[model samples]
Target chain A: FVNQHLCGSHLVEALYLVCGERGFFYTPKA
Target chain B: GIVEQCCTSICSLYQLENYCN
Candidate 1:
């Protein structure tokens, strides 16, 4: 899951929001 | 940023490390 998932999206978006575009990206099991 | 610290409460190191790779 990327930024469109239910659970994983929240975390990915949070990471992007806090860390910015240049920071690490995450995706939980889809 | 300390990912180790960020993941302290909810998620897991293996989960974080797993999808990261």
Candidate 2:
């Protein structure tokens, strides 16, 4: 849905980096 | 709303992460 943003998978990394566990790491279909 | 889209993306990121299966 965006080009200038972190992919869902990538965000799972950064999100945990920014916070902690209790999350998911699903990637985009396209 | 300089970072409006930015935060919007962040919101989606948060939802996708926390709500994934």
Candidate 3:
């Protein structure tokens, strides 16, 4: 699931900071 | 629309500080 390898992880936190409801972070596997 | 907590979905935060477990 993405919540493990992607969301709810470091990637989400970092992406949230920059994106801030502006954009969505797309993972390689996504 | 529902109004609760900071954002939508009630207390659902973008990032959780406390562990639900």
Candidate 4:
């Protein structure tokens, strides 16, 4: 599942930026 | 050969801004 995880991280970083959390943001679970 | 494929795949995936759902 590394392929999926690796590809998905790109989205995660984008999500953070989109949310306006310019520096850092943390979440426990979905 | 295959290494470049991986780079391209991830590169395209990252460029997908309008379809990130």
- TM-score of each predicted structure versus truth: 0.35, 0.31, 0.33, 0.27
Could you tell me the lDDT of residue B20 within candidate 1?
A: 39
For model 3, what is the alpha-carbon lDDT of residue B11?
A: 28
What tier of docking accuracy does candidate 2 attain?
A: incorrect
lDDT of 4 at A3: 40
> What is the fnat score of candidate 1?
0.04
* Per-model CA lDDT versus the true structure: 0.42, 0.43, 0.34, 0.36
lDDT of 4 by residue, A1-30 (tens): 214332345545554554453443333232
Clashes of each: 0, 0, 0, 0
Interface RMSD of 4: 10.5
Error of 1 at B4 (Å): 11
Off by over 4 Å in 2: A1-4, A21-30, B1-21
Error of 2 at B11 (Å): 8.6
Candidate 2 docking DockQ: 0.16
Model 3 residue B12 distance off true place after TM-score fit, in angstroms: 29
Question: What is the C-alpha lDDT profile of model 4 across B1-21, one tens digit per residue?
Answer: 212322234433343232233
Which lDDT tens digits does candidate 1 get at residues A1-30? 322322435566555554454566552222
Candidate 3 residue-wise lDDT, A1-30, digit = tens: 112233334444544554565655333342
Per-residue lDDT of model 3, residues B1-21, tens digit only: 112221223223343322111
lDDT of 2 by residue, A1-30 (tens): 423455445544555554445543443432
Docking class of 3: incorrect
TM-score of model 2 (first chain only): 0.39
Ranking of candidates on lDDT, top first: 2, 1, 4, 3
